[model samples]
Target: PGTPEVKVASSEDVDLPCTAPWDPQVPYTVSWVKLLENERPYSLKIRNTTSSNSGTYRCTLQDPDGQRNLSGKVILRVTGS
Candidate 1:
C-alpha cells in the first residue's frame, strides 16, 4: 500500500486525516511533521489557511524498537475574490 494523502483548500475549513501503520493491537505514537525551510509538528486540526501554508507533510509511526514513516503533500491554490 501507499502513504496517507492530505487534501485541503486555501482559506477554507478542512481536516487532514492521518494514521500510523503497526500491529493493530499494539500502541504507537504518530508524529506529524510539516517540512518547510525547517521541520515542525503538525496534527489533524481546523485552521484558517492560506496559499503560503502549502508544503510537504509527513507522519511517523514510533515504538520502543523502531519506527516507520509515511507522507503526502498538499498544494493550496488561491482563486479569485
Candidate 2:
C-alpha cells in the first residue's frame, strides 16, 4: 500500500494529524523528523508552506523501558498558489 498523503495549497496550514499508543502522561518526547529538522520533541506544525514543503515526514515514538520504537510517515503535496 502507498503511504498516507495530505494535499494543500501553498500558503495554507499543514495541520497534519498524529497519534500515539502510549498514555497521555508518558513525558511526551515523541520526535518528528524528515520535514523541518532532524528531530523535535513537540508535534509538527507548518504554516504558510510553499511548493518546497512537499515531502514526507516521519514520527518516531521511543521506549527506553524495553520495546523498540514505533514509527509512521506521511507525504505532503503542497501545490503552489
Candidate 3:
C-alpha cells in the first residue's frame, strides 16, 4: 500500500509486514532480509524478528510471470524492553 515501517520494544517480538503492489490472488513470493552497519559485520535474515533483531530490513518481491521485482526498505527501532 504505502511506505512500510515497523517498530518494537527491546527484548520483545516483532512482526515486519511486507507486500508488493500486486493482486492478492496473483502468485508471488516475498522475502525479508537484514543487514548491519556502523560496526561489526553481521547479516541476519528476517524470517522472524526479536528485540536483538532490531536493524534495517529489506523486503524483496518477485513476479515470475513478468520477471519483475519490487523492493521496500525499512528501519526497525527497538525501544524499552
Candidate 4:
C-alpha cells in the first residue's frame, strides 16, 4: 500500500513513516531519499520546508536476508507559510 499525500506549510517540518513486512528479529536497514538529494535516513525530516522541497520521497528497507522493499512513493506538498 502507498502512503497518503502529505501537505504542510512552508518552514514546517514533516515526518515520513516507513516500514517493511518482516519479523521483529530480522535485522534490517531503513533509508530515505528525497527527489533531488542523496541524503538517506530512517525518517525523513524536512525542516523549514520550501516550494523546492515539494517532491516525491521514497523509503527503502534492506534486510540481512538480501531482501529489499520499497515503500510507496509519498508526495509532499509545501505551501507558503
TM-score: which candidate is best? 4
Per residue, candidate 1 scores C-alpha lDDT tens digits across 37-66 of 612233445477676655555556566456
Report the alpha-carbon TM-score of model 3 versus the true structure.
0.62
- Which candidate, 3 or 4, has the higher lDDT? 4
TM per candidate: 0.52, 0.67, 0.62, 0.68
Superior by TM-score: candidate 1 or candidate 3: 3
Per-residue CA lDDT of candidate 4, range 19-73, in tens?
Answer: 3344466566777777675233456777888899888787777776675554546
**lDDT tens readout by residue for model 3, 1-81:** 344566766665555655334555556677677767623112223444456776667777777685787776677777775
The residue ranges of model 4 lying beyond 4 angstroms of the native Cα positions read 1-3, 19-25, 36-41
lDDT of 1 at 18: 49
In model 3, the runs with Cα more than 4 Å from the true position are 1-4, 37-51
The most accurate candidate by lDDT is 2
In terms of lDDT, the poorest run of 10 residues in model 2 is 34-43
Clashing pairs in 3: none
What TM-score would candidate 2 get against the native?
0.67
| lDDT values for all models | 0.52, 0.71, 0.60, 0.70
The lowest-lDDT stretch of 10 consecutive residues in candidate 4 is 17-26
